[PDB]
From a paper:
When conducting Ala substitution to investigate the role of the substrate-binding residues in our previous study, we found that substituting S523, a residue that binds the carboxyl group of the substrate, to Ala leads to 2.5-fold increase in 5-Br-Trp production and very low di-brominated product. Before conducting engineering, the crystal structure of AetF-S523A in complex with Trp was resolved (**[Table tbl1]**). The electron density maps corresponding to Trp were clearly observed in the substrate-binding pocket (**[Fig fig1]**). The binding pose and the interaction network of Trp to the enzyme are identical to those of the wild type enzyme (**[Fig fig1]**). This indicates that removing S523-mediated polar interaction poses minimal influence to the binding of Trp. Noteworthily, we failed to obtain the complex structure of AetF-S523A and 5-Br-Trp despite of great efforts, which should be attributed to the low affinity of the variant enzyme to the compound. This also indicates that the S523-mediated interaction is crucial to the binding of 5-Br-Trp, such that the Ala substitute is incapable of accepting the substrate that shows a flipped pose relative to Trp and displays low dibrominated Trp production activity as previously proposed. It should be noted that AetF-S523A still produces trace amounts of 5,7-di-Br-Trp (**[Fig fig1]**). AetF-S523A, a variant that was identified in our previous study, exhibits around 3.9 % activity to produce di-brominate Trp compared with the wild type enzyme.
The first documented single-component Trp-FDH is AetF from cyanobacterium *Aetokthonos hydrillicola*, which catalyzes consecutively bromination on C5 and then C7 of Trp to generate 5,7-di-Br-Trp. More recently, a class of “single-component” FDHs has been identified. These enzymes fuse pyridine nucleotide-dependent flavin reductase and FDH on the same polypeptide chain, an advantageous feature in the application aspect relative to canonical FDHs owing to the omission of including a flavin reductase. The action of FDHs requires the reduced flavin and molecular oxygen to generate hydroperoxyl flavin intermediate, which oxidizes a halide ion to form a halogenating reagent hypohalous acid (HOX). The flipping allows the carbon-to-be-halogenated to be oriented toward the catalytic residue K258 and within the hydrogen bond distance to the putative general base E200, such that the halogenation site on two substrates is switched from C5 to C7.
Author numbering: 1 to 579, 585 to 612, 631 to 653
The structure:
């Protein structure tokens, strides 16, 4: 009887296959001849874009230990080349066929295929990814479209990439949406670049709910009155968050687009622009699009005629070339039959950690948990360890399964509360999920085992990337010691992030929101850093057109668009003329922290002074309990 069948092999399955090979666990992979969207994109020469996620969060530990030198955003080409390199390693273990049906029995499954070949396996892992409406726009994308009006009903990373590609052809862009959360993918800390995933310090949730809520939520929830922030200048960007019924923030189910702010884009790419564009570094600054009117927001119920293909806004009846109905992702699951008869019904919340379904025996889901920020790699690497342990260690399998239903209820209570299921329930803060799995497996760190201030920075401020949990113990990867060292040396041991928590520990939510926006450049959607880059934008558009052999007349003036922008930007044309604690507090804080790096915590003196009380309390956080684990 085959011990393990893995169904689907692209990106998610890679770390699990690595661990099964290491422990010489008998396994077979079944994966479609057709491959993935990355194959559609490769074949048709449209791997001409870049990830919305950092190298550190997007490649697996066992690659980073070799290949990490600096933080950067990988290209689509680099991500695909890495899939292909791992496929080549394991191709002999891959049967090229398509699973049509799985019949699940008490201790095995029967797997049916398009060819007709059937397989029996004790343990079955699904790593088949998602179907996505929007993939055709990307894979079949036509750039000879010019001066046309596009209407999007949803903002997501796919819409943002499409928009990035349309705008340089003077395509006009209308978003008819119920608001969206956009976040600069790279930010300044005292004029050094940090990818946003570097600044989440998620284990601060263990100090308290309320404290972590203040570290994180002012850029998302409409909390500051600062007229510089995109959600004040363009309030149609705001959302109905009335659904949120959890003290865990950011909540499970929050999705965000990560985008290049034009100032950071300029800093990286100004000096070899055309070459950086051809590599896939595309300017996708939605905030700059709103600023410049290249995109407009209209209310969610701005009526439109689908027969005449018209949107009417103010007094112009705008004909549109295309309505984009907005991305929805659904797992590519074959039919699964409970005791080989009753269709399994898939729902994220009814699975433990997005991995273990109820009423199935020895079936696991790998790659169906989506990270709020950072790459999928963080999520699938930890899921792969979790699955590997469940398959290979009956003691662990029994420990998790014995109370599976209670664990799932306690997880759902903690992260969703009373909210009804939503299509984005599968979206999680990466540094809660990785930590959650680490504590289930037992490869977590204990806060009480911190000895020095250096140790508290590593526990609380060092990002919860999967490789954090592969330094020592059961899943240790060779070279993680040197990788952690490089990362720490290049980011001042995450002292800046740590002193953010020190600065706001005494503030209420309104005070922390004001302080967040008191910077010369606050982290996200700072509309003061847009006007200065108008000339660079024109250089960018001409560089984009040069790389993609486009010609269009800006001497040709779409006078109708110019008119609808005015109407859309009315709140902005009032709010912006009304336009630095954080910078100074962080500057002072870092100096203090970097000065006591190697000081013993437990022995730090009594009697700032209460910032020492606080630092000593970090050995005994009071919100450490997670009832789906204990
Ligand atoms: C446009 C785009 C951009 C993305 N950008 C990023 C990014 O910036 N950062 C990031 O971290 N992630 C990104 N992702 C998400 C994620 O990394 C990809 O979706 C990735 O391909 C997921 O890998 P996977 O292995 O889960 O699924 P896939 O890569 O889709 O591989 C699954 C494989 O299973 C096969 N298969 C499916 N069903 C069956 C079956 N029944 N039988 C046999 N074989 C089957 C498929 O043919 C496929 O080859 C992006 C996704 C898309 C679409
Ligand atoms: N804590 C950092 C970074 C940050 C806040 N909210 C976020 C949401 C997602 C990612 C990063 C962040 C800050 O206050 O600026
Ligand atoms: N185009 C993809 C992007 C994506 C999916 N999952 C991700 C995880 C991390 C980063 C990007 C993604 C989508 O939004 O459907």
């Amino acid at each position: 009887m085959l011990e393990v069948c893995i169904i689907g092999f692209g990106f998610s399955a890679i770390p699990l296959v690595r661990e099964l090979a290491r422990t010489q666990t008998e396994f077979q992979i079944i994966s479609a001849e057709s491959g993935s969207v990355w194959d559609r994109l490769s074949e048709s020469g449209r791997l001409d874009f870049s990830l919305v996620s950092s190298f550190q969060t997007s490649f697996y530990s066992f690659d980073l230990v070799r290949d990490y030198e600096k933080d950067y955003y990988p290209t689509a080409k680099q991500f695909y080349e890495m899939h292909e390199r791992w496929r080549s390693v394991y191709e002999e273990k891959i049967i090229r066929d398509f699973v049509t049906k799985i019949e699940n029995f008490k201790d095995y499954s029967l797997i049916s295929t398009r060819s007709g070949k059937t397989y029996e396996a004790k343990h079955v892992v699904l790593a088949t990814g998602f179907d996505r409406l929007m993939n055709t726009f990307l894979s079949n994308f036509d750039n000879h479209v010019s001066n046309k009006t596009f209407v999007f009903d949803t903002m997501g990373d796919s819409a943002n990439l499409l928009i990035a590609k349309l705008i340089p052809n003077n395509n006009k862009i209308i978003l008819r949406t119920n608001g969206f959360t956009a976040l600069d993918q790279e930010v300044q800390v005292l004029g050094k670049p940090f990818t946003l995933d570097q600044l989440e310090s998620p284990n601060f949730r263990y100090v308290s709910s309320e404290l972590y809520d203040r570290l994180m939520m002012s850029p998302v929830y409409p909390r500051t009155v600062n007229p510089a922030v995109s959600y004040n200048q363009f309030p149609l960007i705001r959302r109905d968050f009335s659904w949120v019924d959890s003290k865990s923030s950011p909540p499970n189910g929050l999705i965000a687009i990560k985008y290049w702010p034009i100032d950071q884009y300029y800093y990286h790419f100004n000096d070899d622009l055309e070459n950086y564009i051809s590599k896939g570094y595309l300017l996708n600054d939605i905030a700059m699009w709103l600023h410049t009117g290249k995109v407009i927001l209209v209310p969610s119920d701005t009526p439109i005629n689908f027969d005449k293909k018209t949107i009417t806004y103010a007094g112009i009846e705008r004909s549109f070339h295309q309505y984009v109905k907005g991305d929805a992702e659904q797992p590519r699951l074959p039919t699964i039959l409970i005791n080989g008869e009753t269709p399994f019904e898939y729902l994220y919340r009814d699975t433990f950690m997005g991995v273990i379904p109820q009423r199935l025996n020895n079936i696991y889901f790998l790659g169906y948990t989506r990270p709020f920020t950072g790459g999928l790699a963080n999520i699938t690497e930890m899921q792969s360890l979790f699955i590997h342990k469940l398959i290979t260690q009956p003691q662990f399998h029994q420990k998790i399964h014995q109370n599976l239903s209670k664990r799932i209820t306690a997880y759902n209570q903690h992260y969703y509360g009373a909210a009804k299921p939503r299509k984005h329930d599968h979206t999680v803060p990466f540094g809660f999920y990785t930590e959650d799995i680490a504590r289930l497996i037992g490869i977590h760190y204990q806060p009480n085992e911190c000895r020095s201030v250096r140790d508290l920075l590593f526990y609380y401020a060092f990002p919860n990337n999967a490789f954090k949990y592969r330094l020592k113990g059961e899943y240790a990867v060779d070279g993680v010691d040197e990788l952690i060292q490089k990362v720490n040396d290049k980011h001042d041991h995450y002292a800046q992030v740590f002193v953010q928590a020190l600065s706001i520990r005494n503030m209420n939510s309104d005070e922390a929101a004001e302080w967040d926006h008191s910077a010369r450049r606050f982290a996200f959607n700072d509309m003061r850093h847009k006007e200065g880059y108008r000339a660079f934008l024109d250089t960018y558009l001409k560089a984009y057109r040069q790389v993609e052999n486009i010609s269009v007349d800006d001497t040709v003036v779409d006078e109708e668009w110019n008119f609808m922008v005015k109407e859309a930007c009315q709140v902005r044309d009032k709010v912006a003329p009304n336009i630095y604690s954080k910078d100074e507090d962080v500057n002072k804080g870092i100096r203090l922290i970097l000065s006591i790096l190697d000081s013993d915590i437990s022995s730090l003196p009594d009697s700032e002074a209460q910032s020492i009380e606080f630092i000593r309390r970090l050995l005994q956080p009071k919100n450490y309990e997670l009832l789906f684990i204990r």
